[PDB]
């Protein structure tokens, strides 16, 4: 019922493609991969990173608070 031939109505659209044996599999891989990755990470880093930053701060604070919770209070054994 839902196969190729009856998916959508498309008019006046031209597509050009070439054979995979005709073109390279890695056309300028590093020289255009690096700026594209940098663009994607600079468009998403402010939405993604600060929650995990404050997870790191909460994790370190909780671990150190537990460590000083196990620490001996020097105020005890001071009266006698």
């Amino acid at each position: 019922g839902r196969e190729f031939g009856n998916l959508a109505r498309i008019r006046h659209v031209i597509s050009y493609s070439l054979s995979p044996f005709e073109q390279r599999a890695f056309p300028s891989y590093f020289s255009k991969g690096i700026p594209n990755v940098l663009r994607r990470t600079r468009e998403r880093i402010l939405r993604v990173a600060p929650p995990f930053v404050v997870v790191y701060l909460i994790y370190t604070w909780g671990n150190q608070e537990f460590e000083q919770s196990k620490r001996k209070n020097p105020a005890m054994y001071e009266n006698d």
């Binding site: 839902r2 196969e3 190729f4 998916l7 959508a8 498309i10 939405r47 993604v48 929650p51 995990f52 404050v54 997870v55 909460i58 994790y59 909780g62 608070e65 537990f66 919770s69």
Partner: protein, 380 residues
């Protein structure tokens, strides 16, 4: 002549579901993960079958049979640690699959989503009983704790717990029936996954833009065939570097001791993928409150399609709800960390705040944010 691929009644279903299936051209690597889950299921089943040819479900001999598998069966340690780390890989791929479904608005496929949350419940039950199966110290005490908190239901809870146990406590009958149930449930999971694929294939897949991708669809073969093969290879790389190099970084050492009913461990945990729910279960000082908190913490995914108040399906063009989503992932990681911690200061107040924030972000903050985002685009 006759095209055999489109006419043979067994090859027609295989064609329509894997070869000539019209898939969106722009789906990212996250859409690999569900196929990985299926592969993981098969891997688990295969490894489970090769654990079943030597495992004995007797409390006198279960630990001895597991050690015999690890020490005397040829490459039996390999199959056992592949089974354990494949359960861990199953839950990693399951969590990322659910996160993809939450982020890209795929829950509007409501029947597929509900069959999914049924599959998630079945997989969690299977993994729990499987972890009980080696009959270590940790297995026995985890089963005892989970069933004891399951006894919190009024007027039927003690009877139901003694019915599940087959006795006064966790004993030989519990281990044998857990072996039977852990054997039989992954085939029900496979059948439910077939229903899951059918309910997806009535309407096609979603794309990361969330738009109607009918203008740009490609056949599943060879594009997503080779993409799924590459994802399978990467998942196998991570699974074998988990098995062959760090085989005990995810398990607990106390499971290598035999089950002592007289000796209790100083700190009782489930395995890591349950841990966040355990934190929610101990964020309320009431037994029924914690039990219902765990049940609604899993069932809030089923409640999720009724909370969508935005005119855009995906979160690609929705930055405020993106921020709320990553805060949700953040305090899910926080609840996972709290669930492995003992119950003292400040873990109690951190877990309580994390559970409150989890339920308030899913229930309250995301629909209000979607209303605000619709107001910003002059739509509301």
């Amino acid at each position: 002549m006759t095209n055999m691929r489109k006419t043979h009644p067994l090859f027609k279903i295989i064609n329509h579901s894997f070869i000539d299936l019209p898939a969106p051209s722009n789906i990212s690597s996250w859409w690999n993960f569900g196929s990985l889950l299926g592969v993981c299921l098969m891997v688990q089943i295969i490894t489970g079958l090769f654990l079943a040819m030597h495992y004995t479900s007797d409390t006198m001999t279960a630990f001895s049979s597991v050690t015999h598998i690890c020490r005397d069966v040829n490459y039996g340690w390999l199959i056992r640690y592949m089974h354990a780390n494949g359960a861990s890989m199953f839950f990693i791929c399951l969590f990322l699959h659910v996160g993809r479904g939450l982020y890209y608005g795929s829950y509007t496929f409501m029947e597929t989503w509900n069959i999914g949350v049924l599959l998630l419940f079945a997989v969690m039950a299977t993994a729990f009983m499987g972890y009980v199966l080696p009959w270590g110290q940790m297995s026995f005490w985890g089963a005892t704790v989970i069933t004891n908190l399951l006894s919190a239901i009024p007027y039927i809870g003690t009877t139901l717990v003694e019915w599940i146990w087959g006795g006064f406590s966790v004993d030989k009958a519990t281990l044998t029936r857990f072996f039977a149930f852990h054997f039989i449930l992954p085939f029900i999971i496979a059948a439910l996954a077939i229903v899951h694929l059918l309910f997806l294939h009535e309407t096609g897949s979603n794309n990361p833009t969330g738009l109607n991708s009918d203008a740009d669809k490609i056949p599943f073969h060879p594009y997503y065939t080779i993409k799924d093969i590459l994802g399978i290879l990467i998942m196998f790389l991570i699974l074998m570097t988990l098995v062959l190099f760090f085989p005990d970084m995810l398990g607990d050492p106390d499971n290598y001791m035999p089950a002592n009913p007289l000796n209790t461990p100083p700190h009782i945990k489930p395995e890591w993928y349950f841990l966040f729910a355990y934190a929610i279960l101990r964020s309320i000082p009431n037994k029924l409150g914690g039990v219902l908190a765990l049940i609604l913490s899993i069932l809030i995914l089923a409640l999720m399609p009724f909370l969508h108040t935005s005119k855009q399906r995906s979160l690609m063009f929705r930055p405020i709800t993106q921020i709320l989503y990553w805060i949700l992932v953040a305090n899910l990681l926080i609840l996972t960390w709290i669930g492995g911690q003992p119950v003292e200061h400040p873990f109690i107040i951190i877990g309580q705040l994390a559970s409150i924030s989890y339920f308030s972000i899913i229930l309250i903050l995301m629909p209000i944010s979607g209303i605000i985002e619709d107001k910003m685009l002059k739509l509301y």
